[PDB]
């Protein structure tokens, strides 16, 4: 029976979640995880905050009415405009990604000047400079809007030329800065992390925020006693409200998980 | 209005604990609480180590502590589930962040664990780790050396370096990739350890991923401080602030710090 495993779940508007997915499976490998990509109304990055709420909640009920035992907001924008507000009306432990690529960005920096990627949306909500001072006022934060990059990710073109030339050119005005830390700040971006290291070199510290946020997922379950603690045969679920084929081709990609169920779905 | 992040432990390993919180949370205000009087723990009863322990956290509830980290491997194995229980602040002790760690460092889910005799009795490390992993493979050593090593000034010199290779060399015989340092003194000894094991090996100082919880929960609460405007870090020891004051302000870089005497039980 699965009836005594509960799952953690994830929410994100697409593929991107998927980066918190892999390190989760890597620390906490009794886990179950329930996972909803709202590919159908991705990108969420041009989103106003009220409307990125709007649909937060609604995937945060879906994973609820499934049983789920821990939140994870495993995306930026849903994380700066929705966190507090599920975190109080839930009973269950919710956490984000933006304070665990906060704290890993400043663990990395030697000169504590850091940079972030992220949406339009993750941007104008200033959400990692805010966390970042708010952990160390005295560093510096500088942020860029690759609004291309989920294009990109969601297309399934994160390998190939176009990835290639659309982080050098989305990338270019970092190299005139002494940043020496930078910070994933979409939870798609790892998935082309080989490439924005590439481009960046040596110099430069690419942080994915998945291996810190699992961290506090693992942290959290135990400081909770929600550790699973069954050998029930673990069953993971991936829901989409886009394709899943397409869904499939990338998740097991990112994750070596040949035998996935991945299920449409519909919400709002 | 400020509150500090209490510390307690029996004696000065807790302080690499706090050398972490420095680093992670420089906004922070600290209050350490080392019973040097009373140490080592790791011998008494558990009853016992519970009683000293719950001594030390009440000393600091009284002055305004809004969470609490059990700094110290044998009194996290004692008293750590009461206290959490017991107290309306956030507690947390060095094992399961470490064991986090290690399982985070780990690439073929073979660890090693380096303690007092205590601690490696205890069986906390191995408890802790195959909790989130039940297939991961612990070995314990216990390194009843290396604390007189650390605390008589030691640490980087030929004696740590012999004391060193003859306590580790066991490990040498596995295929352990991960040595998890499971004694808060153990830390300032790593750079030989490393040397000792080589570069296949990840050796965890548990107070980075213990400083990273504290950050953690404090944001969870909504309890992190914006500013060090203002910060006054109180450090008290049951033993003499003379040895203590001179341990802590090298390990720390904390040239002007205050360390006041307390009488704590009897
Ligand atoms: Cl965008
Ligand atoms: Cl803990």
Redesign the interface.
Known sequence: SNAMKQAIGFIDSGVGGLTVVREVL?????EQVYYLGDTARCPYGPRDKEEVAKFTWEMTNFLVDRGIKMLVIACNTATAAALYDIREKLDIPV?GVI??GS?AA??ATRNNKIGVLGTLGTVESMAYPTALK?????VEVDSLACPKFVSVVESGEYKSAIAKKVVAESLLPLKSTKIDTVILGCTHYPLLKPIIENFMGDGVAVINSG??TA??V???L??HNL?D?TDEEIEHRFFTTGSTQIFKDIAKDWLNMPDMTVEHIKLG
Do not use: M, T, V, W
Request: charged letters at 35%; proline letters at 7%.
């Open positions: 890597k620390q906490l490998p009794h956490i304070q665990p704290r400043l663990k708010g952990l160390n006022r005295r291996e810190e961290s506090e693992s942290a959290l135990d400081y550790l603690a």
